[PDB]
């Protein structure tokens, strides 16, 4: 929950790469430097793409992070994100995240990117009905039933997956930007009632 007294960054963040990320974020001299909960409370954004991070253990102590860039790492477990109540924008492309249950109570999350994670089962995304942007390109998804609950989506990429049935998108009236290239789609009837689309890409299907 909280760091009660000042503690070395090295001790809170066991992943050597993530400890260095925190050191640089707070402009500290060394991962041996001690930080207070007050200093950790000052972190609202972490930029740590392409950083060879295997674990974000310790991030639980950053209650005020709203923007988290973790594209291109070696993550499989996002349980340390479970109680980051203020997370708004989350980028996790090119990891290997399959268990999405830790996203369930991220109720301020507006944007989620999980491209190229090898995902097939997205049932757990049903618990994010407030999402506005969702990027799932380059995965192994077939069944998008649960996206019918995500009635606030305005941007959705499902390109380069295994989808043939897009009926669950029929009621997503707020969609503006929809990317469906490189799937198995022949029948777009269910999209006929979407009135607010600016972008709809359907290139290169394999029927």
């Amino acid at each position, epitope marked *: 929950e909280t760091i009660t007294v000042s503690t070395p960054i090295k001790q809170i963040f066991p992943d050597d790469a993530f400890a260095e990320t925190i050191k640089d974020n707070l402009k500290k001299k060394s991962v041996t430097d001690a930080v207070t909960q007050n200093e950790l409370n000052s972190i609202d954004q972490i*930029i740590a*793409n392409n950083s060879d991070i295997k674990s974000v253990q310790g991030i639980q102590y950053l209650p005020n992070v709203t*923007k988290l*860039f973790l*594209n291109g790492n070696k993550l499989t477990d996002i349980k340390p994100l479970v109680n980051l109540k203020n997370l708004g*924008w989350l*980028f996790l492309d090119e990891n290997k995240i399959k268990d999405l249950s830790s996203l369930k109570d991220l109720k301020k999350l507006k*944007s989620l*990117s999980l491209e190229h994670n090898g995902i097939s089962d997205i049932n757990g995304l049903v618990h994010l009905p407030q999402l*506005e*942007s969702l*990027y799932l390109g380059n995965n192994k998804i077939t069944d998008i039933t649960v996206l019918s609950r995500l009635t606030k989506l*305005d*941007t959705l*990429s499902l390109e380069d997956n295994q989808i043939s049935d897009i009926v669950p998108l029929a009621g997503l009236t707020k969609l*503006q*930007n929809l990317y469906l290239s490189k799937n198995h789609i022949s029948d777009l009837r269910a999209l006929a009632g979407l009135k607010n689309l*600016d*972008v709809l*890409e359907l*290139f290169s299907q394999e029927a």
Partner: nanobody
Amino acid sequence: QVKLEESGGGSVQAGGSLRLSCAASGHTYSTYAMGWFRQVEREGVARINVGGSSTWYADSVRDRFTISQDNAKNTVYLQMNSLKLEDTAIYYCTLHRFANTWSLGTLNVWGQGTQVTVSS
């Protein structure tokens, strides 16, 4: 390998006008977001969906600036009218495939920047 070629800028008198251009090369996108940020921390100014029609403007420039595109030419244009002292800044062309991510800046392709100075 995405390249942003910026044209336009310099000094202008308050109340005057300036038009910036930015052309994107080396990409495959059917549609994408392109526009400008500025830095007087860097802030978004104007965005358009190249290959679509949606736009976004910062509140401070909304009705004075107009962004447009030549889709086939992969170029966007920023017509800056009724220029104000508050508009002096370095202006950066910038691009992302997805408009909502474009707004964050962090993941965008970035141009070199052009100096705009509004006097009097």
